[PDB]
């Protein structure tokens, strides 16, 4: 129903392989690969505000689903894309050669980003406030 | 008694002036100044683990009070210093020309970092799980 919450990273797969594939320096990969931080989502209807802890970087993006928005990626590149809401619990987008799916089930968010034959998956759990 | 917990930044004063004085790139100052993230402390006796969201960076430091420690600063430089306990609820350290005081008051943490005539102050609040 609502994505709003603070989510602590529980586990992830292929962080290093994904970050190497998009061109992140090995120095940043090693610094960030073991960080299990907190991301925050605020949802207001179709409007989303994301404060994402991704490795050693914090990225803050804002978008209305269905509208073109400029979003900052891991590389610092700002891409223009459209994020769609599928059902009430799935955010779907594609930028460059990456497909990203953000799925909420109960208190668990599963983020799956596919780049070629690399599937980068993050599992995070809502902090019960 | 215990600093352990997750803390969300509530307010801060003089971020830009402090970050300019320590030489952070202007582009990182502008993107980080409005981020209100979550920092995590894990305390075991005199041993501390910090995962700090500071602007658009995540910094992870460990140390034991009273023992010389190597700590990463906001600029990425590693400094060697000793963190002291003043009372039971204040952590105090000096490095370079900066004095840092971290004070716990119930669910509120206040971090005060003095550099010459600039006082950079962060107030955060415990996330109640
Ligand atoms: C498409 C813009 C974001 C770019 C950053 C990519 C790094 C992974 C992003 C996943 C965050 C999705 C929100 C769920 C919580 C989390 O996994 O932190
Ligand atoms: C002593 C250098 C540590 C890294 C420098 C980053 C500047 C901000 C440090 C403040 C963090 C103190 C912990 C309280 C929680 C918080 O304010 O995020």
Swiss-Prot record, chains A, B:
This is Fatty acid-binding protein, liver. GO terms for biological process: cellular detoxification; cellular response to hydrogen peroxide; cellular response to hypoxia; fatty acid transport. GO terms for molecular function: antioxidant activity; chromatin binding; fatty acid binding. The modification Phosphoserine is found at residues 11, 39, 56, 100. The modification Phosphothreonine is found at residue 51. Plays a role in lipoprotein-mediated cholesterol uptake in hepatocytes. Binds cholesterol. Binds free fatty acids and their coenzyme A derivatives, bilirubin, and some other small molecules in the cytoplasm. May be involved in intracellular lipid transport. Keywords: Acetylation, Cytoplasm, Lipid-binding, Phosphoprotein, Transport. Forms a beta-barrel structure that accommodates hydrophobic ligands in its interior. It holds the Pfam family Lipocalin_7. InterPro entries: Calycin, Fatty_acid-bd, ILBP. It comes from the Eukaryota. One of its GO terms (cellular component) is nucleus. It is found in: Cytoplasm. Belongs to the calycin superfamily. Fatty-acid binding protein (FABP) family. The modification N6-succinyllysine is found at residues 31, 36, 46, 57, 78, 90, 121. CDD domains: FABP1.
